[PDB]
Design a protein around this ligand. Structure first.
Ligand SMILES: *[C@@H]1O[C@H](CO)[C@@H](O)[C@H](O)[C@H]1NC(C)=O
Ligand SMILES: *[C@@H]1O[C@H](CO)[C@@H](O)[C@H](O)[C@H]1NC(C)=O
Ligand SMILES: *[C@@H]1O[C@H](CO)[C@@H](O)[C@H](O)[C@H]1NC(C)=O
Ligand SMILES: *[C@@H]1O[C@H](CO)[C@@H](O)[C@H](O)[C@H]1NC(C)=O
Ligand SMILES: *[C@@H]1O[C@H](CO)[C@@H](O)[C@H](O)[C@H]1NC(C)=O
Ligand SMILES: *[C@@H]1O[C@H](CO)[C@@H](O)[C@H](O)[C@H]1NC(C)=O
Ligand SMILES: *[C@@H]1O[C@H](CO)[C@@H](O)[C@H](O)[C@H]1NC(C)=O
Ligand SMILES: *[C@@H]1O[C@H](CO)[C@@H](O)[C@H](O)[C@H]1NC(C)=O
Ligand SMILES: *[C@@H]1O[C@H](CO)[C@@H](O)[C@H](O)[C@H]1NC(C)=O
Ligand SMILES: *[C@@H]1O[C@H](CO)[C@@H](O)[C@H](O)[C@H]1NC(C)=O
Ligand SMILES: *[C@@H]1O[C@H](CO)[C@@H](O)[C@H](O)[C@H]1NC(C)=O
Ligand SMILES: *[C@@H]1O[C@H](CO)[C@@H](O)[C@H](O)[C@H]1NC(C)=O
Ligand SMILES: *[C@@H]1O[C@H](CO)[C@@H](O)[C@H](O)[C@H]1NC(C)=O
Lengths: 420, 411, 50, 50
C-alpha cells in the first residue's frame, strides 16, 4: 500500500522541493492506507553509470512514475534516454520534466514516456497561427539538423495541408557547416521574404553571421525562429527585429515538479478505480518479463484532464506531448529582448507593446516582392523559335521582313549540340 | 578482431557448434587475428545485458557484437540502440526482439538489425497488390505508432506509381473502440482489399467487428504486416482464413546461417578496411571510471560497410541503418488455420509460387457459393490475342484482362 | 523508383524557369500538376508525307 | 424502370448479412416496405451506412 516515485533530478534543494511536493500530495486524498514514497538520484559523469544507478535504484525501489530532469550540463550532452529505455523495457511510466527534443515523438522508441512540456514542432503551430495574423502564403523553411527537423517539416506540411498552401522551398543540409552562404543565395531568388529557421546554437550563429553580410536582414525580410536561436553566440550574432518564441516557465523547473506531482497523484488515485493492480518486478537478477498494466496505465494517462496546478490545465495528446501551452512572442530590439505578444492554447494575443521590424517602418511587411525578372524558357521549334548564332560579337542584326517591318530579335542563351 | 556472439535461446543450439562454425568457413585469415567468443544467457534483463556487454568490451577489446534472442520482446533492442552510443562497437541484431525492427536511430550509433523496415514491407505489400491487379483499396489505421509515416509512405508510393490506384478514405481510430464512431468508420468501407496497420491486441477486436459487420467475405481481402501478426504459436480463431501477411521470419534461414552471415559481414568489413586503413583495432577501454567527452575514434566501420557481399548474398546496409535487399516471405492464413510460405522476395522480383490465387473461402461455415467462374479460352488471331505482361507497369493494360498460360520446361 | 519530370517542366518545377512560352501541347497529364492559360493557337495532328 | 433486384430481409437483422445487401444499394431512390417497429432500426442502420 505504498507508491514509490523515482526522481532523476539535479540539485538537493530541488530534491527537498520534490519531497515537499510529495508531502503536499498527501493532503486532499485523505488518510487512506496508500502512501507516497520518493527516492531521488543525481548526476553521473557519463550516460553509462546513469543507466546503471537508475536501473538498480528503480528496480530495488519498484516505482510507478519516474521524473527525470537534467538540463544544467555545460557540454552538449543532453539525453535522459537510457532511463527511458530501461523503464520502457518494463513499460514503467516516465514523466519527463525538462527534455524537449522531438525524438520523443515516436512512442515506438519510447514506449512508456510522457512529458508535460511541448517539443519544438509545436512551435510550428504558432508558425501557422502567425501566418493567420499576417495572411502570408509564401514561406521559406530553413532547417539545419536532421535529428528532429524532419518532424518539424512534417508538422509544417500538416498545418499547410488544411489550407492546401505550399511551402515554396525547404532546405535540409549539414549540421555544423560554414558554406551556408550558398543556401542563403539559393534562398534569395524567390518572391518570398518570410524566413523560418530552427536549428542549434552554432548553426543559428553561422546563418546569422552569413545573412548579416549578405544583406538579408534589411527591408522586407521576416525572421521567425524558435527558442534555441536567441541564446548564446547566436544571440551574440543576432540581427535585430527578429521574432522568436519563449516557453513560459521553460527553465522554471520547481513549479513544474509540483505540477507533475499532482499529475502523478491524480493518475495513481484514478489507477485504484479498476482492479488487478500489478506490481513492479525484481528485474535486476531473476525477472525479465514486462509489467502488465503498462499500456493500461498509459491509456489512463491518455484520459488525463486537469484544472489544478501552477500550469493549470495540463493534458496529453495522442503523442503524449503537452496540449495548449502559453508562449511568449519575443522581439529583439537593439540587442534587448522585448515581449511583443503572447500565445494562448490556440490563439495569438498581441499586447500593447511596440513591434519593431528588422527593416524600415514598424508596419507589417507584405514581403512578397513580385519577380519582374520572369525567367522565360522555350525550345528550338522550327516555325516558332528561330535560333541563330552571334552576328558580330554577341549581337544580332536588325533585319527587315518582306513587308517593311524590322525583324524583332532577342538575346537568348543556350547550348550548341547534344550532351554526349 | 575479437568478436563476441551471445545468443540467448530457448531452442537448444549448442555453443560448441557455434564455436566450431568458423572452422569449415574461410579460415584464411586476412586479419592477423580473427577470434570469436560464443556465450549464452538465460535472463535477458537489461542490467545483465549491459553487464555482459561491458564484460565483453573489457574482454580483450571486442570490436564486434553479435546478439540474438529467443523471446518476442523488441525492447531488448531498444536497450541495444543505447549501447552502440556508448561502447562504440558495431552491433548486429540476429533473432527475436533483436530481429524486431525499430524506427529511427542516432548518427553516432553503429547498431544494425537483420530485418526490414516498415516502408520496405509496405513496398512488398503494394507489390503484391500490383501483381494481382487489386487497385481499389482502403486503409484502416489505429494509434499504434509509426502510422502517420505509414500513411505518408503509402500516399507517396501511390503518387509515384504508374499503377492507377483507387484509394478510399483512410480509416482513423481513436482508442479501444466503443463501436460507436469506429462503427461509422468501418461502414465507410465498401471496397474489396483492406490494408490494416494496428496492434496484435486490437487486431482481434477489429477483425471480430469486421466479421460481425460482414467485411470478411471471400470477395474481400485483408493484408497486414508482421508487426501486428505475431509468431506462428498464437493463431486466434477470430482471424479471417486467408489473411495475407509479409514477414522476415524465414525458417530455412535459421540461426546458424544468421550468425554465419553476421560473422561474414564483420570479417569482410574488417578485412576490406584493413586493405584501406592500417590500425583497425580501436576500442573503448571500459564502462567504468570516466568523465564526460568520451574518447571518440576516428575511422569506424559505420561509414564503410555500405557495400558488403557474402558469397553472392546482397547483405549491404542502407545509410539509414537497414538492409538494402532484405529477405521477405509472403504467407497466408490457409484453411488449416496455419501459415504457409506463399512467396519469397528476391532483390526486386516478387517470386510467387501460387500465381493461381485460390479463394481461401472458409471464413465461416455459411457463405454463398460459386461466384468466381473458372473460364478457359484459346488464342485466335481475330478473336483472342494474348500477349506478354507490360514492361512499364508489370500489369495488363486496362482493356486487356489477366490470364495464365501453363508453360512447361521440357519432357 | 521515383517519378520525375524532365525538359521545360523540369526547369520550371525546379524554379529555374518562371513561364513556359513555347508551342505547349496541352494534355491532361501536364494539367494535373501545373496550371495553363487559354491557348493562343488551336492546332491538331497531321502526317507529313513525300 | 432501371430497378435493382429486390433486397430482402429475414429477421430483426444481425447487421451481418443484411448489411451487405444494403451495401448493394448504390442507387438513390429506395422504396421501403416495413412496419414502425422495424423502421427505426432500418433507418439507424442506413444512417450508420451512409
Ligand atoms: C522510502 O524510500 C526511502 C528512500 O531512501 C527508503 O530508504 C525507505 O526504505 C522507503 N520506505 C518504504 C516503506 O518503502
Ligand atoms: C562557400 O562560401 C564562400 C563565401 O561566401 C563562397 O565564396 C563559396 O562559393 C561557397 N562555396 C560554394 C561551393 O559555393
Ligand atoms: C550588400 O550591401 C552593401 C551596401 O549596402 C553593398 O556594398 C554590397 O555589394 C551588397 N552585397 C550584395 C551581395 O548585395
Ligand atoms: C516558478 O513559478 C512561478 C510562477 O510561474 C515563478 O514566478 C517563479 O519564478 C518560480 N517559482 C519557484 C518557487 O521556483
Ligand atoms: C481482473 O482479473 C480477473 C481474473 O483474475 C478477470 O476475470 C477480470 O475481468 C479482470 N478485471 C479487469 C481487467 O478489469
Ligand atoms: C494561458 O494564459 C491565459 C491568460 O493569460 C490563461 O487564461 C490560461 O489559463 C493560461 N493557460 C495555461 C495552460 O497556462
Ligand atoms: C484563449 O483560450 C481560452 C481557452 O482555450 C479561451 O477563452 C479562448 O480560446 C481564448 N481567449 C480569447 C481568444 O480571448
Ligand atoms: C557550334 O557548333 C558549330 C558546329 O558544330 C561550330 O561551327 C560553332 O563554332 C559552335 N559555336 C558557336 C556557334 O558559338
Ligand atoms: C541458464 O539458466 C540457469 C537457470 O536454470 C541459470 O542459473 C544460468 O546462469 C543460465 N546460464 C547463463 C550462462 O546465464
Ligand atoms: C563494393 O565494395 C567495395 C569495397 O569492398 C567498393 O570498393 C565498391 O565501390 C563497392 N561497390 C561496387 C559497385 O563494387
Ligand atoms: C536482381 O534482379 C534482377 C531481376 O530484374 C536479376 O536479373 C539480377 O540477376 C538480380 N541481381 C543479382 C545480383 O542476382
Ligand atoms: C527443352 O528445353 C530447352 C531449353 O534450352 C528448349 O530449347 C527446348 O525447346 C525444350 N524442348 C521442348 C520439346 O520444349
Ligand atoms: C514433350 O514436349 C513436347 C513439347 O514440349 C510435346 O511434344 C509434348 O508435350 C511432349 N511429348 C511427349 C511424347 O511426351
Amino acid at each position: 500500500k505504498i507508491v514509490n516515485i523515482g526522481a532523476v533530478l539535479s540539485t538537493r534543494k530541488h530534491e527537498q522541493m520534490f519531497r515537499e511536493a510529495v508531502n503536499q500530495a498527501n493532503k486532499r486524498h485523505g488518510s487512506w492506507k496508500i502512501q507516497l514514497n520518493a527516492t531521488s538520484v543525481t548526476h553521473k559523469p557519463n550516460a553509462i553509470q546513469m543507466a546503471l544507478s537508475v536501473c538498480e535504484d528503480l528496480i530495488s525501489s519498484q516505482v510507478y512514475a519516474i521524473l527525470v530532469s537534467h538540463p544544467p550540463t555545460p557540454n552538449d550532452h543532453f539525453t535522459p534516454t537510457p532511463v527511458s529505455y530501461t523503464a520502457g523495457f518494463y513499460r514503467i511510466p516516465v514523466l519527463g520534466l525538462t527534455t524537449r527534443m522531438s525524438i520523443y515523438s515516436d512512442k515506438s522508441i519510447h514506449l512508456s514516456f510522457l512529458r508535460t512540456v511541448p517539443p519544438y514542432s509545436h512551435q510550428s503551430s504558432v508558425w501557422f497561427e502567425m501566418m493567420r495574423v499576417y495572411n502570408w502564403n509564401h514561406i521559406i523553411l530553413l532547417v539545419s539538423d536532421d535529428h528532429e527537423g524532419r518532424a518539424a517539416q512534417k508538422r509544417l506540411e500538416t498545418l499547410l495541408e488544411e489550407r492546401e498552401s505550399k511551402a515554396e522551398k525547404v532546405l535540409q543540409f549539414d549540421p555544423g557547416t560554414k558554406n551556408v552562404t550558398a543556401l542563403l543565395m539559393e534562398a534569395r531568388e524567390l518572391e518570398a521574404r518570410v524566413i523560418i529557421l530552427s536549428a542549434s546554437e552554432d548553426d543559428a550563429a553561422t546563418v546569422y553571421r552569413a545573412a548579416a553580410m549578405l544583406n538579408m536582414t534589411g527591408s522586407g525580410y521576416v525572421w521567425l525562429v524558435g527558442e534555441r536561436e536567441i541564446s548564446g553566440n547566436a544571440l551574440r550574432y543576432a540581427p535585430d527585429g527578429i521574432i522568436g518564441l519563449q516557453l513560459i516557465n521553460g527553465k522554471n523547473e520547481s513549479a513544474h515538479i509540483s505540477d507533475a506531482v499532482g499529475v502523478v497523484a491524480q493518475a495513481v488515485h484514478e489507477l485504484l478505480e479498476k482492479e488487478n493492480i500489478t506490481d513492479p518486478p525484481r528485474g535486476c537478477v531473476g525477472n525479465t518479463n514486462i509489467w502488465k498494466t503498462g499500456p493500461l496505465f498509459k491509456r489512463v494517462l491518455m484520459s488525463s484532464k486537469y484544472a489544478d496546478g501552477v500550469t493549470g490545465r495540463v493534458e496529453f495528446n495522442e503523442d503524449g506531448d503537452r496540449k495548449f501551452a502559453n508562449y511568449s512572442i519575443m522581439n529583439l530590439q537593439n540587442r534587448k529582448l522585448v515581449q511583443v505578444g503572447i500565445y494562448n492554447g490556440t490563439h495569438v494575443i498581441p499586447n500593447d507593446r511596440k513591434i519593431i521590424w528588422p527593416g524600415g517602418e514598424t508596419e507589417k511587411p507584405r514581403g512578397y516582392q513580385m519577380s519582374t525578372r520572369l525567367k522565360i524558357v522555350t525550345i528550338h521549334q522550327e516555325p516558332f523559335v528561330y535560333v541563330k548564332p552571334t552576328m558580330s560579337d554577341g549581337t544580332c542584326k536588325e533585319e527587315f521582313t518582306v513587308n517593311g517591318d524590322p525583324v524583332k530579335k532577342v538575346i537568348c542563351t543556350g547550348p550548341n549540340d547534344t550532351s554526349p | 578482431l575479437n568478436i563476441a556472439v551471445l545468443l540467448g535461446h530457448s531452442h537448444d543450439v549448442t555453443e560448441r557448434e557455434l564455436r566450431n562454425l568458423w572452422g569449415p568457413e574461410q579460415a584464411t585469415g586476412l586479419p592477423l587475428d580473427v577470434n570469436v567468443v560464443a556465450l549464452l544467457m538465460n535472463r535477458t534483463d537489461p542490467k545483465s545485458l549491459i553487464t555482459h556487454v561491458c564484460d565483453l568490451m573489457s574482454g580483450a577489446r571486442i570490436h564486434g557484437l553479435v546478439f540474438g534472442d529467443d523471446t518476442d520482446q523488441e525492447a531488448v533492442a531498444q536497450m541495444l540502440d543505447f549501447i552502440s552510443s556508448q561502447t562504440f562497437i558495431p552491433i548486429l541484431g540476429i533473432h527475436g526482439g533483436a530481429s524486431m525492427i525499430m524506427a529511427d536511430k542516432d548518427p553516432t550509433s553503429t547498431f544494425f538489425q537483420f530485418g526490414a523496415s516498415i516502408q520496405q514491407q509496405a513496398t512488398v505489400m503494394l507489390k503484391i497488390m500490383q501483381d494481382y491487379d487489386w487497385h481499389v483499396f482502403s486503409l484502416v489505421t489505429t494509434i499504434f505508432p509509426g502510422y502517420r509515416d505509414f500513411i505518408s509512405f503509402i500516399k507517396t508510393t501511390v503518387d509515384n506509381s504508374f499503377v492507377g490506384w483507387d484509394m478510399q478514405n483512410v480509416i482513423t481510430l481513436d482508442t479501444s473502440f466503443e463501436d460507436a464512431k469506429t462503427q461509422v468508420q468501418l461502414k465507410k468501407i465498401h471496397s474489396s482489399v483492406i490494408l490494416l496497420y494496428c496492434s496484435k491486441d486490437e487486431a482481434v477486436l477489429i477483425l471480430s467487428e469486421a466479421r460481425s459487420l460482414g467485411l470478411t467475405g471471400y470477395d474481400f481481402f485483408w493484408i497486414v504486416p508482421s508487426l501486428v501478426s505475431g509468431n506462428t504459436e498464437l493463431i486466434p480463431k477470430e482471424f479471417p482464413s486467408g489473411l495475407i501477411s509479409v514477414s522476415y521470419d524465414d525458417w530455412d534461414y535459421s540461426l546458424e546461417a544468421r550468425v554465419r552471415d553476421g560473422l561474414g559481414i564483420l570479417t569482410t568489413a574488417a578485412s576490406s578496411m584493413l586493405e584501406k586503413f592500417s590500425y583497425i583495432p580501436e576500442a573503448k577501454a571500459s564502462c567504468y571510471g570516466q568523465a564526460e567527452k568520451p574518447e571518440t575514434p576516428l575511422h569506424t566501420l559505420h561509414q564503410f560497410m555500405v557495400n558488403v557481399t557474402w558469397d553472392g548474398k546482397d547483405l549491404s546496409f542502407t545509410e539509414e541503418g537497414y538492409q538494402v535487399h532484405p529477405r521477405l516471405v509472403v504467407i497466408v492464413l490457409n484453411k488449416d488455420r496455419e501459415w504457409e510460405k506463399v512467396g519469397k522476395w528476391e532483390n526486386q522480383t516478387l517470386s510467387l509460387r501460387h500465381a493461381v490465387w485460390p479463394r481461401y473461402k472458409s471464413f465461416s461455415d455459411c457463405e454463398p457459393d460459386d461466384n468466381h467462374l473458372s473460364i478457359v479460352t484459346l488464342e485466335e488471331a481475330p478473336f483472342v490475342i494474348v500477349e506478354d505482361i507490360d514492361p512499364l507497369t508489370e500489369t495488363c493494360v486496362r482493356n486487356t484482362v489477366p490470364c495464365r498460360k501453363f508453360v512447361k520446361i521440357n519432357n | 523508383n521515383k517519378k520525375e519530370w524532365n525538359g521545360m517542366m523540369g526547369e520550371l518545377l525546379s524554379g529555374q524557369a518562371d513561364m513556359i512560352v513555347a508551342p505547349l501541347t496541352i494534355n491532361n497529364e501536364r494539367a494535373q500538376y501545373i496550371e495553363f492559360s487559354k491557348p493562343f493557337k488551336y492546332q491538331g495532328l497531321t502526317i507529313l508525307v513525300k
